[PDB]
């Protein structure tokens, strides 16, 4: 169900690193679209740092008049959720859009990945 | 459910600006595929004007023998609907096609966005 | 439901022009991926001829060792079905693939369109 | 349902060639993204060899520090399942991703196909 995805967004968006991390199965992975290949894999014990570093990135974006807006997850059965994301300037300009994929197993996240429109570095 | 999406198409297609606007949550956004970026964001109080201006555009299209045809929304659970759109000439020629995304929250539209085949200016 | 889509494939695949045509609403359209634009629109009374001409095309393909294989439609609620198509040579070579979109209204087809991988003329 | 897809992954991943093969209808096809065209068709009696040869390929990949990870299938009704695949290096680098399509009929696989991001030879 969507509860673990909701919990993840709320806790990770406030810096409750420990709650956010615990949304992931011990074998779960969070794939970010950076690095040599199509992405970089983060395991559960890499994910707390990742959250912290993405929060710091978000603050720089905000200071520039840009921020991401995440919609409530759309569930496809119990084990998959799609989250629409839109990155917008305060002037009303979409600068990026994408979909966060969540694959769940047993109420935990086993895969978080993103598909984005603009391949930002 | 699809009722608010249906209400939106019927009212906005006839110029009932006030009913159409009220289909959107106060925090909702309607993204149009124009502007510097991947689109331009319209908030609820920008949406009435937008409807009026798109109706005027539609009349110019019709006078040229071109018009858009929208299918009934296909629901994915309660909170997402997809609307197929086809732009056709009176001679039977598809000139554009796309999908209108609706994300709902609490019976209101929180995101209307479009994906189109031809990136028309 | 899928019955009208199944009926359409069975009847149109055997040349029962009248049954196939009657699967379409009077306002339905069948879009083929040929012509000046992204496709060409066929109304209900253009569709019988279209079926005949596509059957004749299919026979030429078969004589060349190529044929299309259609899977059973995958339903998304009552009013949308997706049909996977694969075009294969008798030597085991996929030469095209795509998805037939069916949008239904009231048990009739209101839109049949195709998305294909190879933009064959 | 997903049972036949699960059975197929478990048995084919261990070399139980006979169980894996019997997951396919007698008319089923497994399409691999190699060959002259958009893929190559394997019938039921070609599929055992295919499994063996893909296992041997997998062992070479593993010896290079690369392996594929398959998620549990996401069902769309009874007759379609999507399986997310990610190919990763042991250093945490996604090198390929895709989706395995399964179309079922009567509890058997009638079509297995893949869509991949990187068109690897
Ligand atoms: C993992 C890739 C990140 C990108 C996507 O996933 C979709 C996209 O294109 O934009 C994203 C970047 C973005 O704009 C924001 C606001 C990231 C913030 C983070 O958001 C949380 C809630 C986790 C989800 O990322 C905690 C952080 C504050
Ligand atoms: C917001 C982008 C507009 C495009 C799409 O969304 C999908 C696409 O490619 O074509 C569209 C343009 C089009 O052809 C029409 C008929 C617009 C009319 C408007 O339609 C209403 C019902 C609202 C929905 O747009 C009120 C207006 C009369
Ligand atoms: C309308 C576009 C046609 C293409 C698609 O729709 C998907 C695709 O890429 O290949 C198709 C062409 C094809 O290979 C066949 C076998 C057409 C035969 C016709 O099939 C029937 C059953 C109607 C459905 O087309 C009656 C005809 C004998
Ligand atoms: C049929 C195309 C193969 C590719 C995909 O399907 C998705 C993708 O991009 O990567 C795949 C290649 C891959 O990395 C692995 C691990 C193949 C192993 C095989 O996996 C089993 C379980 C069958 C499913 O393939 C038995 C074999 C050991």
Coordinates of C-alpha atoms in Angstrom, one line a residue, chain B residues 69 71-76 84 86 88 91-99 117-118, chain C residues 27 29 31 34-41 76 79-80 101 103 110-111 113-115:
Chain B
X69 CA -11.3 15.5 -29.9
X71 CA -12.0 10.8 -25.1
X72 CA -13.6 10.0 -21.8
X73 CA -11.0 9.8 -19.0
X74 CA -9.5 6.4 -18.2
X75 CA -9.3 6.1 -14.4
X76 CA -6.3 4.5 -12.5
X84 CA -6.6 10.7 -24.8
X86 CA -6.5 13.7 -31.0
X88 CA -7.7 16.2 -36.6
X91 CA -10.0 16.0 -44.2
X92 CA -9.3 13.1 -41.8
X93 CA -5.7 13.9 -41.0
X94 CA -4.3 13.5 -37.4
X95 CA -2.1 16.5 -36.8
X96 CA -1.4 16.0 -33.1
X97 CA -2.1 13.5 -30.4
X98 CA -1.5 13.4 -26.7
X99 CA -2.7 12.5 -23.2
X117 CA 3.5 14.1 -29.7
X118 CA 4.3 17.2 -31.7
Chain C
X27 CA -19.1 8.3 -34.0
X29 CA -12.8 6.4 -35.5
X31 CA -6.7 5.8 -36.9
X34 CA -0.5 6.4 -42.8
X35 CA -0.8 9.7 -44.6
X36 CA 0.6 13.3 -44.4
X37 CA 0.3 13.5 -40.6
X38 CA 0.5 11.2 -37.6
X39 CA -2.2 9.1 -39.0
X40 CA -5.4 9.0 -41.1
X41 CA -8.9 9.0 -39.6
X76 CA -7.8 -1.2 -18.0
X79 CA -13.4 1.4 -21.4
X80 CA -9.8 0.8 -22.5
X101 CA -5.3 1.1 -28.4
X103 CA -11.2 3.1 -26.3
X110 CA -15.0 4.9 -30.2
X111 CA -11.3 5.0 -31.0
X113 CA -5.4 3.7 -32.8
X114 CA -1.9 2.2 -33.1
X115 CA 1.5 3.0 -31.7

